[PDB]
Amino acid sequence: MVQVEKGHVAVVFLNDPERRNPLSPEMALSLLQALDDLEADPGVRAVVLTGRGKAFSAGADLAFLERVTELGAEENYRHSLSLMRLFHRVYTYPKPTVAAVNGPAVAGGAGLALACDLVVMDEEARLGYTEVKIGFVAALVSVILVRAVGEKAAKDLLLTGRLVEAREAKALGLVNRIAPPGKALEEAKALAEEVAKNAPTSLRLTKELLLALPGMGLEDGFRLAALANAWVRETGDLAEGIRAFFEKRPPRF
Amino acid sequence: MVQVEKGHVAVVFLNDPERRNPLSPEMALSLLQALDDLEADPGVRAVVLTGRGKAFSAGADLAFLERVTELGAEENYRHSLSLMRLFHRVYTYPKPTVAAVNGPAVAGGAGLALACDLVVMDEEARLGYTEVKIGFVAALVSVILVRAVGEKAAKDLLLTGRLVEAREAKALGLVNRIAPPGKALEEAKALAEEVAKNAPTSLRLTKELLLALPGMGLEDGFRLAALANAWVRETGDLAEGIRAFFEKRPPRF
Amino acid sequence: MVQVEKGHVAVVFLNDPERRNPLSPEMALSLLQALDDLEADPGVRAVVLTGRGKAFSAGADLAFLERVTELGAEENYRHSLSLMRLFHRVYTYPKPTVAAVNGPAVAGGAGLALACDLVVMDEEARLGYTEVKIGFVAALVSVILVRAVGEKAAKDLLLTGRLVEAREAKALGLVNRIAPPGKALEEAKALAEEVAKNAPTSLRLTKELLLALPGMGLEDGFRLAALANAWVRETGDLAEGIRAFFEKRPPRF
Amino acid sequence: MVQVEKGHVAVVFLNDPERRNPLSPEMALSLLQALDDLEADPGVRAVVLTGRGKAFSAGADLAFLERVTELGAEENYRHSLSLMRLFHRVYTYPKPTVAAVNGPAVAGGAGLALACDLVVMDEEARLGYTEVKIGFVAALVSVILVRAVGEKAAKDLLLTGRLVEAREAKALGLVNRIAPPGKALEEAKALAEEVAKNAPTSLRLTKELLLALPGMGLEDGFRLAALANAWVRETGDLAEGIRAFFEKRPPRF
Amino acid sequence: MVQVEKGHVAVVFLNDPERRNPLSPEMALSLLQALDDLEADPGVRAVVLTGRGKAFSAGADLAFLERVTELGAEENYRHSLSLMRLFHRVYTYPKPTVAAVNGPAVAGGAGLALACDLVVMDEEARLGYTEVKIGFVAALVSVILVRAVGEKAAKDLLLTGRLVEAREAKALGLVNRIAPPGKALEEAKALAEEVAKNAPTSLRLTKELLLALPGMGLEDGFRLAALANAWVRETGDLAEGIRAFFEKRPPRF
Amino acid sequence: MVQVEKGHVAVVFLNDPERRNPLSPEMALSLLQALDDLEADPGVRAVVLTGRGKAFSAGADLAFLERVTELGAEENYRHSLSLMRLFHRVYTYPKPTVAAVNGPAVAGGAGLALACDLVVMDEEARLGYTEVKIGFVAALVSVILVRAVGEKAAKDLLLTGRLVEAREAKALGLVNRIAPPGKALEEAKALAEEVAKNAPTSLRLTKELLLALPGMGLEDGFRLAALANAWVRETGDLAEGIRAFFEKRPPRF
């Protein structure tokens, strides 16, 4: 249940407006299928992600709350693993991803939004991890969050379960930019395009690096960087770029 | 030397006003004994921590400075281990802790304050790690600090040893909220209560997670999260919460 | 190609004004030689680092761009290792280092600046990691950056390759202070001196600690801290300091 | 190019006898497709893996050696990532895997064999990582090897590139059992079945744990274990097992 | 339910012979109380640990198997945490511990034995982690095991759940020595005494180090070691030892 | 105080026979100077390291024991750092190193020997870490040892301080080969040459990898490997090797 507008900067819409775009198993799966196609389309250089409706993703899946408390341990684990496969797939995406927080993003969706490379939030949107308020744990989100904000900010958001607003969200480092009420998407598509002008090789790798580093010692990180700094020096894009520079012309990666 | 006002939101006061609440061995021990009782009291859901007097904790223990430079290696290590047992116990506390920085918090106390889950500072209070100014090292604090603020902010605070003020302290991520001159406690007790409304299970675990994650790779962290996300789905609080939701009634965890 | 003004607070100038202080192999080497001498000079307690000219360090080394794309894998690796040896040497420096960003710092220089303990930037200066714009990867910088700013801020800067300005640079945690247009150096020398008043022992160790911690679990970090907190208690500077305190006199470390 | 004999203990054969079962891109892919089906077949509890022919996997893919040295940086990375996806998929497999080293396993195949949960080697088979002898690096293998053998044993095998024999291979911890010349498979199928008698839940998790632990501090590991030890106590298999025990009957997981 | 024979080399006996020394909650607690006293007794330099009866520790706690499958998630976690507190306390013990495996050690006990510094096993004893055979997970043990044996050996033992014998147990690195059928204890007490002749300071620290290292990068580990190597050089025991050496007399630590 | 016989396989002799080759500060320095020259000599492909006299390295530096207990904290740290710089330099050496344990190696020397890539020990030699026996801590060695042997083997050796013999040393993984009483060197030079036949590029990198991996999660390690596996595919040695293979001729790296 997602709509995809292919293009250099592809756009994926969570299609379940009235339900408010719940990250139901079905929805999670549809979102993956897209990312696959989109990852395989050589024309797509970036992917904006947004929601159809008044929100981005925030709507208690009553269909879910009813069952969950009765599923078996083995089924619960099997499911968590699926949902985690989504977050990871997004956070790990090979191409630059940008979340366009048009409306509210609560719990699941809030993490889904955080899992994107960059985030552009509607000046009137809200964001929050409410799991604890009802007995849930924003476990899957925690993974990304410790890397996005300071520890004290993490505790605040996860222990109170409050919803922050665009002004605070940026201040804390949850979102990169705030678009005036109206087109968080337009602005996100803008941001994307810019990032898309840059080298496809350099982008992926930069992302690859930012993944691994946090999980290692200074020296090992430098061992990794050095090696990369090296490899990158034999790539076409570098060749292309350096030429375009010595030809006072735009690079055609 | 601490006073404890039991309650859903318990409050512990560092009782040594005129000396200014020094983290002397004795004081460290009394604080532990409390945390134990309080951790064992099923009525206590949160613990606010503050100081009796003009400060929170900031007062050179001359009794200490005089001895220290003459103790034996084996005694010094034995002591550091005790002080570290305090910081850890606080940072690791099973229940949500909130430091109410009524007055100045310098060196030891500053770390003690930082070791709390959340921090509410008096609009007129000061905070600072002065160890280097005299030859000490805020080693025990460093552990928590790298997780609380950016590296450049860490260096600043630890290399200059300056005292920051409420305005800067929040901006950097050292404190969550600033209470108007007068009741940092009242506001902290407020914050606590809110956090206390949420699920006891979800809270602990959220805390458990935030502890371990920083120390691991993305994938392992996700392995951990998934497993938790799973376990949490068979807990009473979740059952309780989801019910209360389908009964449009307040949850009774 | 660097000038060194010895003193308690030494100052190193990148001498290549018109070329704009490129981090060429030669320049990298000269900078090392200085750090060595300066590390060996018992009179030097801190080192400010700045650039001669309109910039700090930002100037495409055309001599480099021309060759690079033709060097051999083995030569590229050999070189990355040299450049990485510089960053590391700076980030690892035993004495407090302070970068005085007088002018623009782009790519290489931007990292060089980030590798310093503290940073004072000219109210009119710019900073940015442009590697991706042309096909390069700010790999070596990534190592330090993940520790300096939030993940979302890292992505922004490295994926867009934009240049930030003094106002944003501080807000994000890239720089500690902003000097009014004119003397970023003067202010940096100021900052340094202050840090230099503090204990030489306590400083080094504080730095040593901040290096290792990020790369380890809470408990191991505490194991490290405890041990340090211990060792530090048998150092002369501590003896000196505690005396000077009981003699209401300035410490002579 | 692989044959699959479904069953409680499934068996996959590398089908390329005369070429000697090279881990060519095609072969790598076929092997994945199998693991998927097999992972999805509720009747399959274990998977033995062996080779058709005089070897397990050891045959210079001349088709590969000829091209490789001419591919582009971007193509090389793209490929390494594919091969690494295989190793990982095998090492990460949800079900117990057992490599039946019927014949020689050199380089690629040697790692492929090492990536299995357990290994049964033909009393006359050989194993070795020869990458360095020709200019290659057993990089992908290193990942698993540091966990399989002592550092000094790792260096030996990777620096000399020698081929070890069944007697030494077990002694070092490269293989679990040695079957008399003739049926490494039969014995491997045996080993598998045994492991397959045990709890499907307990097995997966035990594997999950052994993955993550090496990459974390003692305490975090215990945090992980505790949580698991907990979760496992609400699984059907445990219920099933404990019953079967109190009914002096065989467990029907 | 444990007996303690104080002495330079203290000995703790698991007292529940006929039940076969099950690691029941009660037993776990009694064992802790001992370790505390013993850790506080300045006369005790080492602690041997063994079992009263035909075994060391191996006896299905039917009282436990009956309940377990019905406890609540929150109770299960609460319990795992208690059992984990035991393993950790043992593995973390400040003084050298030695397990004297007089008889069989299965599951719980097997881990309990592994958690000791050194292990002396009866030439006729058996050891094994059977959790999977019935639906359990040797999670808590995994933590220590990955550090004790090679990965392939870990999988073997945990996936088959088989019981190994003295000959194999040593070969794999599960036990240090094998005593002839009769006095595993006598030999363990012997081993202990020897270790006890050495410096109390040097021992603890050596242990402290072996804990933390596995969980960190080469350089950080060296940062830790260096610091320790340093601290240790100002300890009385070193002073005592070096003297005794220059006085051709036995050291009196 | 070391002698160097340049050659494809260089040999360094610890020259202090009668004193028994103590790792005195002076000796440590001379050894470094050699490694530098030797690392810079394009003719040297491997370095064997051995001792002149009845031993490899084992001789209480009485000159040291006398001072040590009186040096200042700051001096002790300064020294540990120097000694650690040696171990690291050896363990980190860019070229393959091989220790030829002609005679006894105790404490310092034992670690020095362990820090080599491979070890060939005299069938009559002994090895042991005796630090604890006198009050010292084999801290610097611990770093390498946890990677060389199982945890239980580490404890044994470091807690008892005993000296093991060639037969046990290999069994545990402390040494790779045992030469018949007479020429541990000859055999080591042999081993070296063999390793030296292989690709200079592949060797270094293999070493680089084995350094970093232990300190990271499975996935990050694979991220590292993949990248390397990639880079290596554009190196001359690979080109050279693959040619020599298609020319049925010996490779001339």
* DSSP for residue A42: T
Q: Tally Cβ neighbours within 10 Å of residue B85.
A: 15
Q: Tally Cβ neighbours within 10 Å of residue B251.
A: 18
CB of C147 within 8 Å of a chain B CB? The answer is yes
Specify the DSSP element, H or E, that contains E181: none
Contacts of D144 (CB under 8 A, 6+ apart): D87, D91, D111, D114, D115, E151
- Candidates E170, E39, E182, E184; CA nearest to E101 is E184
Q: Is D8 helix (H, G, I), strand (E, B) or coil?
A: coil
Task: Tell me which chain D residue has its CA closest to the CA of residue A239.
Answer: D73
> Residue A129 and residue A145: Cα distance in Å, rounded?
11
The answer to whether E236 contacts B74, with C-beta atoms less than 8 Å apart, is yes
Q: Please report, as a single letter, which amino acid is at residue C30.
A: S
Check whether residue E145 and residue E240 sit in a common domain: no
**Contact indicator for F185, A180 with CB cutoff of 8 Å:** no
Structural domain range at position B78: 2-198
Q: Tally Cβ neighbours within 10 Å of residue A124.
A: 16
Query: Resolution limit in angstroms?
Result: 2.8
CB of A236 within 8 Å of a chain D CB? The answer is yes
Nearest to F212 among A220, A228, A234 (CB): A220
Which chain C residues are Cβ-neighbours of D218 within 8 angstroms? 217, 219-220
The answer to whether D150 contacts F173, with C-beta atoms less than 8 Å apart, is yes
- Taking only residues 103 to 122 of chain B, the set having a beta carbon closer than 8 angstroms to any beta carbon of chain A reads 117-119
Q: Tally Cβ neighbours within 10 Å of residue A123.
A: 13
CB of C201 within 8 Å of a chain B CB? The answer is yes
Boundary of a domain, candidates A198, A221, A239 = A198
**Contact indicator for D47, D98 with CB cutoff of 8 Å:** yes
**Contact indicator for B39, B93 with CB cutoff of 8 Å:** yes
Cα F54-F57-F60 angle, rounded to 5 deg: 100
Q: How many distinct structural domains can be found in chain C?
A: 2
Check whether residue A134 and residue A213 sit in a common domain: no
Nearest to B229 among A88, A139, A212 (CB): A139
Cα B240-B245-B249 angle, rounded to 5 deg: 90
Chains near F with 3+ CB pairs less than 8 A apart are A, B, C, D, E
* DSSP for residue B158: H
Sign (positive or negative) of CA dihedral B145, B149, B152, B156: negative
Residue positions counted in chain E: 253
C-alpha distances in Å from residue B224, one per residue of A151, D76, D117, E76: 18, 33, 21, 18
Check whether residue F137 and residue F57 sit in a common domain: yes
CB of C234 within 8 Å of a chain F CB? The answer is yes
- Bridge partners of E13, per DSSP, are E3, E50
CB of A216 within 8 Å of a chain E CB? The answer is yes
Check whether residue F41 and residue F157 sit in a common domain: yes
The answer to whether C219 contacts D217, with C-beta atoms less than 8 Å apart, is yes
CB of B218 within 8 Å of a chain F CB? The answer is yes
Angle of helix D218-231 relative to helix B218-231, nearest 10 degrees, comes to 30
Task: Tell me which chain C residue has its CA closest to the CA of residue B208.
Answer: C218
Boundary of a domain, candidates D163, D180, D198 = D198
Check whether residue C81 and residue C99 sit in a common domain: yes
Residue F235 to chain C, least CA–CA distance (Å):
5
Which chain F residues are Cβ-neighbours of B216 within 8 angstroms? 217
Which chain E residues are Cβ-neighbours of B231 within 8 angstroms? 73, 77
**Contact indicator for B123, B131 with CB cutoff of 8 Å:** no
C-alpha distances in Å from residue D151, one per residue of A215, D128, E213, F194: 22, 16, 15, 19
Check whether residue A205 and residue A249 sit in a common domain: yes
Residue A206 to chain E, least CA–CA distance (Å):
22
Q: Are strands E2-5 and E9-14 parallel, antiparallel or unpaired?
A: antiparallel
Nearest to D227 among B211, B219, B231 (CB): B231
Chains near B with 3+ CB pairs less than 8 A apart are A, C, D, E, F
- Taking only residues 163 to 182 of chain D, the set having a beta carbon closer than 8 angstroms to any beta carbon of chain E reads 173-176
Specify the DSSP element, H or E, that contains D186: helix D184-197
The answer to whether E228 contacts C224, with C-beta atoms less than 8 Å apart, is no
Alpha helices for D46-174 (secondary structure H): 62-68, 73-92, 108-114, 131-134, 139-148, 151-160, 166-172
The answer to whether C234 contacts F77, with C-beta atoms less than 8 Å apart, is no
Which chain E residues are Cβ-neighbours of F92 within 8 angstroms? 218
- Candidates B67, B56, B53; CA nearest to B25 is B67
Task: Tell me which chain E residue has its CA closest to the CA of residue A221.
Answer: E217
- Candidates E195, E229, E224; CA nearest to E95 is E195
Residue E234 to chain B, least CA–CA distance (Å):
6
Check whether residue E32 and residue E52 sit in a common domain: yes
Check whether residue C115 and residue C54 sit in a common domain: yes
Kindly report the CATH number assigned to the domain that includes residue B221.
1.10.12.10
Cα A40-A46-A51 angle, rounded to 5 deg: 100
Q: Which of C18, C39, C124, C131 is catalytic?
A: C131
Which chain B residues are Cβ-neighbours of C232 within 8 angstroms? 135-137, 139
* DSSP for residue E213: G
Check whether residue D28 and residue D152 sit in a common domain: yes
Which chain C residues are Cβ-neighbours of E231 within 8 angstroms? 227, 230-231
Extended beta strands in E38-162, E state? 46-51, 97-101, 105-106, 118-122, 126-128
Report residue A10 as tokens: 């592809």
Which chain F residues are Cβ-neighbours of B213 within 8 angstroms? none
CB of E245 within 8 Å of a chain B CB? The answer is no
CB of C85 within 8 Å of a chain E CB? The answer is no
Q: Which of B26, B75, B131, B187 is catalytic?
A: B131
DSSP string for residues in D190-247: HHHHHHHHS-HHHHHHHHHHHHHGGGS-HHHHHHHHHHHHHHGGG-HHHHHHHHHHHT
> Residue B100 and residue B14: Cα distance in Å, rounded?
11
The answer to whether E209 contacts F71, with C-beta atoms less than 8 Å apart, is no
Q: How many CA atoms lie within 13 A of F176 on its CB side?
A: 29
Question: Is B131 noted as a catalytic residue in this protein?
Answer: yes
Check whether residue E172 and residue E222 sit in a common domain: no
The answer to whether C212 contacts E223, with C-beta atoms less than 8 Å apart, is yes
Q: Is C196 helix (H, G, I), strand (E, B) or coil?
A: helix
Cα A232-A235-A241 angle, rounded to 5 deg: 100
Check whether residue B208 and residue B251 sit in a common domain: yes
Contacts of B55 (CB under 8 A, 6+ apart): B20, B21, B102, B103, B104, B105, B109
Kindly report the CATH number assigned to the domain that includes residue E7.
3.90.226.10
CB of E218 within 8 Å of a chain A CB? The answer is yes
Q: Which of A18, A131, A208, A219 is catalytic?
A: A131
> Residue C96 and residue C194: Cα distance in Å, rounded?
11
The answer to whether F227 contacts A227, with C-beta atoms less than 8 Å apart, is yes
> Residue C46 and residue C10: Cα distance in Å, rounded?
6
Residue E84 to chain D, least CA–CA distance (Å):
6
Residue E230 to chain D, least CA–CA distance (Å):
24
Q: Cα F190 to the chain's mean position, in Å?
A: 16
Boundary of a domain, candidates A179, A198, A217 = A198
The answer to whether A212 contacts F228, with C-beta atoms less than 8 Å apart, is no
Which chain F residues are Cβ-neighbours of B219 within 8 angstroms? 217-220
CB of E235 within 8 Å of a chain B CB? The answer is yes
DSSP string for residues in B190-226: HHHHHHHHS-HHHHHHHHHHHHHGGGS-HHHHHHHHH
**Contact indicator for F49, F15 with CB cutoff of 8 Å:** no
Check whether residue F146 and residue F245 sit in a common domain: no
